[PDB]
Design a protein around this nucleic acid. Structure first.
Ligand SMILES: [Mg+2]
Ligand SMILES: [Mg+2]
Ligand SMILES: [Mg+2]
Ligand SMILES: [Mg+2]
Ligand SMILES: [Mg+2]
Ligand SMILES: [Mg+2]
Ligand SMILES: [Mg+2]
Ligand SMILES: [Mg+2]
Ligand SMILES: [Mg+2]
Ligand SMILES: [Mg+2]
Ligand SMILES: [Mg+2]
Length: 125
RNA sequence: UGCUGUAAAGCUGGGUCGAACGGCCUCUAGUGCAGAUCUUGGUGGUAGUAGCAAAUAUUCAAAUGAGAACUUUGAAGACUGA
Protein backbone atom coordinates (compact mmCIF):
# COMPACT_ATOMS: atom_id res chain seq x y z
CA UNK A 1 0.00 0.00 0.00
CA UNK A 2 1.28 3.44 -0.98
CA UNK A 3 -0.92 5.04 1.70
CA UNK A 4 -0.56 5.23 5.48
CA UNK A 5 -0.28 1.61 6.72
CA UNK A 6 -3.56 -0.02 7.73
CA UNK A 7 -4.79 -3.45 8.79
CA UNK A 8 -6.11 -5.66 6.01
CA UNK A 9 -9.43 -4.23 4.85
CA UNK A 10 -12.36 -6.53 5.62
CA UNK A 11 -15.78 -6.05 4.04
CA UNK A 12 -18.21 -8.21 5.99
CA UNK A 13 -20.76 -8.14 3.15
CA UNK A 14 -19.58 -7.42 -0.39
CA UNK A 15 -22.81 -7.95 -2.31
CA UNK A 16 -25.67 -5.46 -2.54
CA UNK A 17 -28.66 -5.67 -0.20
CA UNK A 18 -31.47 -5.84 -2.74
CA UNK A 19 -35.08 -5.20 -1.82
CA UNK A 20 -37.35 -8.23 -1.70
CA UNK A 21 -39.07 -8.96 -5.05
CA UNK A 22 -37.10 -6.30 -6.90
CA UNK A 23 -36.40 -9.33 -9.09
CA UNK A 24 -40.09 -10.25 -9.37
CA UNK A 25 -41.49 -6.83 -10.31
CA UNK A 26 -40.16 -3.96 -12.39
CA UNK A 27 -42.07 -1.47 -10.22
CA UNK A 28 -40.08 -2.59 -7.16
CA UNK A 29 -36.65 -0.99 -7.30
CA UNK A 30 -33.53 -2.59 -5.85
CA UNK A 31 -33.13 0.22 -3.29
CA UNK A 32 -33.22 -1.48 0.07
CA UNK A 33 -36.58 -1.35 1.85
CA UNK A 34 -37.41 -3.11 5.10
CA UNK A 35 -40.33 -5.51 4.80
CA UNK A 36 -43.11 -4.44 7.15
CA UNK A 37 -45.71 -7.06 6.27
CA UNK A 38 -47.30 -9.17 8.97
CA UNK A 39 -46.62 -12.53 7.30
CA UNK A 40 -43.41 -11.73 5.42
CA UNK A 41 -40.94 -14.60 5.19
CA UNK A 42 -38.16 -12.05 4.83
CA UNK A 43 -39.26 -9.90 7.74
CA UNK A 44 -39.53 -13.08 9.81
CA UNK A 45 -36.09 -14.28 8.60
CA UNK A 46 -36.99 -17.69 7.23
CA UNK A 47 -34.07 -19.87 6.24
CA UNK A 48 -33.22 -19.34 2.59
CA UNK A 49 -34.43 -15.73 2.45
CA UNK A 50 -32.19 -12.78 1.60
CA UNK A 51 -29.73 -11.22 4.06
CA UNK A 52 -30.80 -7.91 5.49
CA UNK A 53 -28.83 -4.82 6.53
CA UNK A 54 -28.00 -4.58 10.21
CA UNK A 55 -25.33 -2.92 12.31
CA UNK A 56 -23.43 -6.19 12.73
CA UNK A 57 -22.10 -5.80 9.18
CA UNK A 58 -20.49 -2.49 10.15
CA UNK A 59 -16.94 -1.89 8.98
CA UNK A 60 -13.87 -1.82 11.20
CA UNK A 61 -13.47 1.76 12.35
CA UNK A 62 -9.79 1.66 11.37
CA UNK A 63 -10.38 0.58 7.77
CA UNK A 64 -13.73 2.31 7.25
CA UNK A 65 -14.07 4.66 4.25
CA UNK A 66 -10.78 3.49 2.68
CA UNK A 67 -10.75 2.42 -0.96
CA UNK A 68 -8.78 -0.74 -1.88
CA UNK A 69 -5.66 1.41 -2.27
CA UNK A 70 -5.99 2.62 1.33
CA UNK A 71 -7.16 6.19 0.71
CA UNK A 72 -10.15 8.18 1.85
CA UNK A 73 -11.71 9.87 -1.15
CA UNK A 74 -12.43 13.61 -1.10
CA UNK A 75 -14.43 15.32 -3.85
CA UNK A 76 -12.60 18.17 -5.62
CA UNK A 77 -14.23 20.71 -7.94
CA UNK A 78 -11.38 23.21 -8.52
CA UNK A 79 -7.67 23.63 -7.89
CA UNK A 80 -8.25 25.53 -4.64
CA UNK A 81 -10.10 22.47 -3.30
CA UNK A 82 -6.84 20.49 -3.24
CA UNK A 83 -5.47 22.78 -0.51
CA UNK A 84 -7.21 20.82 2.25
CA UNK A 85 -5.26 17.68 1.30
CA UNK A 86 -1.78 19.23 1.52
CA UNK A 87 -0.84 17.52 4.79
CA UNK A 88 -2.92 14.40 4.06
CA UNK A 89 -1.44 13.23 0.76
CA UNK A 90 -0.74 9.71 2.09
CA UNK A 91 -4.23 9.13 3.53
CA UNK A 92 -6.58 11.14 1.27
CA UNK A 93 -7.00 11.00 -2.49
CA UNK A 94 -8.78 13.56 -4.65
CA UNK A 95 -11.66 12.72 -6.97
CA UNK A 96 -12.46 15.27 -9.66
CA UNK A 97 -16.13 16.14 -9.99
CA UNK A 98 -17.94 14.96 -13.10
CA UNK A 99 -19.16 18.45 -13.98
CA UNK A 100 -15.68 19.97 -14.03
CA UNK A 101 -14.78 21.00 -17.57
CA UNK A 102 -11.95 19.34 -19.48
CA UNK A 103 -9.87 22.51 -19.00
CA UNK A 104 -10.25 22.88 -15.25
CA UNK A 105 -9.78 19.13 -14.91
CA UNK A 106 -6.41 19.37 -16.66
CA UNK A 107 -5.44 22.13 -14.23
CA UNK A 108 -6.55 20.04 -11.24
CA UNK A 109 -4.61 16.99 -12.45
CA UNK A 110 -1.50 19.09 -13.04
CA UNK A 111 -1.65 20.68 -9.60
CA UNK A 112 -2.45 17.39 -7.87
CA UNK A 113 0.58 15.83 -9.55
CA UNK A 114 2.63 18.80 -8.37
CA UNK A 115 1.38 18.45 -4.78
CA UNK A 116 1.71 14.67 -4.66
CA UNK A 117 -2.03 14.20 -4.17
CA UNK A 118 -3.37 10.96 -5.61
CA UNK A 119 -6.32 11.25 -8.00
CA UNK A 120 -8.86 8.44 -8.06
CA UNK A 121 -10.24 9.30 -11.53
CA UNK A 122 -7.18 10.62 -13.38
CA UNK A 123 -8.24 9.81 -16.96
CA UNK A 124 -11.76 10.97 -17.73
CA UNK A 125 -11.70 13.84 -20.24
C1' U B 1 -16.55 1.95 -15.53
C1' G B 2 -16.04 1.50 -10.76
C1' C B 3 -15.47 3.47 -5.42
C1' U B 4 -17.75 4.69 -0.50
C1' G B 5 -21.73 3.60 3.36
C1' U B 6 -24.88 -1.98 7.61
C1' A B 7 -28.43 1.01 5.06
C1' A B 8 -31.56 5.08 3.35
C1' A B 9 -27.97 6.77 -0.48
C1' G B 10 -23.47 9.70 -2.13
C1' C B 11 -19.51 10.09 -5.67
C1' U B 12 -17.28 8.67 -10.35
C1' G B 13 -15.72 6.44 -16.08
C1' G B 14 -18.16 6.06 -21.04
C1' G B 15 -22.45 7.34 -24.24
C1' U B 16 -26.56 10.87 -25.16
C1' C B 17 -27.74 15.96 -24.48
C1' G B 18 -28.15 21.45 -24.64
C1' A B 19 -28.76 25.92 -20.11
C1' A B 20 -28.64 26.03 -16.05
C1' C B 21 -26.97 23.75 -11.31
C1' G B 22 -24.70 22.17 -6.68
C1' G B 23 -21.59 21.51 -1.52
C1' C B 24 -21.75 23.39 3.45
C1' C B 25 -24.50 26.42 8.12
C1' U B 26 -29.55 27.25 8.87
C1' C B 27 -35.17 28.09 7.55
C1' U B 28 -39.56 26.03 5.53
C1' A B 29 -43.07 22.37 3.51
C1' G B 30 -48.46 20.54 -0.97
C1' U B 31 -41.30 16.42 1.04
C1' G B 32 -40.21 9.87 -0.17
C1' C B 33 -45.43 4.66 -2.78
C1' A B 34 -46.18 -1.68 -4.60
C1' G B 35 -50.72 -2.17 -3.38
C1' A B 36 -56.23 1.69 -1.75
C1' U B 37 -62.03 -3.27 -7.39
C1' C B 38 -56.65 4.04 -6.08
C1' U B 39 -56.53 8.57 -10.32
C1' U B 40 -55.04 10.02 -15.32
C1' G B 41 -52.15 8.50 -19.43
C1' G B 42 -49.76 4.64 -21.88
C1' U B 43 -48.77 -0.74 -23.06
C1' G B 44 -49.09 -6.19 -23.17
C1' G B 45 -50.40 -11.64 -23.05
C1' U B 46 -54.85 -13.39 -24.85
C1' A B 47 -54.00 -13.23 -30.63
C1' G B 48 -53.16 -13.06 -36.27
C1' U B 49 -57.37 -15.75 -31.94
C1' A B 50 -63.23 -15.23 -31.49
C1' G B 51 -64.92 -13.93 -35.62
C1' C B 52 -66.40 -11.07 -40.55
C1' A B 53 -72.46 -17.44 -41.89
C1' A B 54 -80.35 -13.91 -41.81
C1' A B 55 -82.78 -11.33 -46.30
C1' U B 56 -82.39 -17.56 -53.22
C1' A B 57 -77.03 -15.63 -57.10
C1' U B 58 -74.15 -14.97 -59.66
C1' U B 59 -71.30 -15.69 -64.56
C1' C B 60 -68.51 -14.37 -69.44
C1' A B 61 -66.33 -10.55 -72.19
C1' A B 62 -64.84 -5.57 -73.33
C1' A B 63 -63.53 -0.62 -71.44
C1' U B 64 -60.83 2.19 -67.64
C1' G B 65 -56.83 1.92 -64.67
C1' A B 66 -50.09 0.90 -61.94
C1' G B 67 -53.46 -2.32 -59.90
C1' A B 68 -60.46 -4.96 -61.13
C1' A B 69 -64.42 -10.75 -57.27
C1' C B 70 -66.42 -5.54 -55.91
C1' U B 71 -66.07 0.58 -61.13
C1' U B 72 -68.48 1.35 -66.14
C1' U B 73 -70.77 -0.90 -70.58
C1' G B 74 -72.66 -5.23 -73.18
C1' A B 75 -74.47 -10.30 -72.90
C1' A B 76 -76.78 -13.68 -69.76
C1' G B 77 -78.87 -15.92 -65.20
C1' A B 78 -82.09 -14.32 -61.09
C1' C B 79 -85.13 -11.76 -57.52
C1' U B 80 -88.62 -7.90 -55.41
C1' G B 81 -93.81 -9.47 -57.90
C1' A B 82 -98.39 -3.45 -57.55
MG1 LIG C 1 -48.05 -13.85 11.78
MG1 LIG D 1 -31.37 26.39 -25.74
MG1 LIG E 1 -26.60 27.78 -2.41
MG1 LIG F 1 -48.55 14.77 -0.42
MG1 LIG G 1 -47.22 2.96 -8.90
MG1 LIG H 1 -47.56 -0.54 1.17
MG1 LIG I 1 -55.50 -0.82 -10.53
MG1 LIG J 1 -56.58 2.44 -16.52
MG1 LIG K 1 -60.64 -18.15 -37.71
MG1 LIG L 1 -72.07 -15.38 -36.34
MG1 LIG M 1 -90.44 -14.21 -58.49
Amino acid sequence: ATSVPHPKIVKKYTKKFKRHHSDRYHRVAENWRKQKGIDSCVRRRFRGTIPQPNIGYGSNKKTKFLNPAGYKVYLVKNVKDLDVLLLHTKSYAAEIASSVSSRKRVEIVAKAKKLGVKVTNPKGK
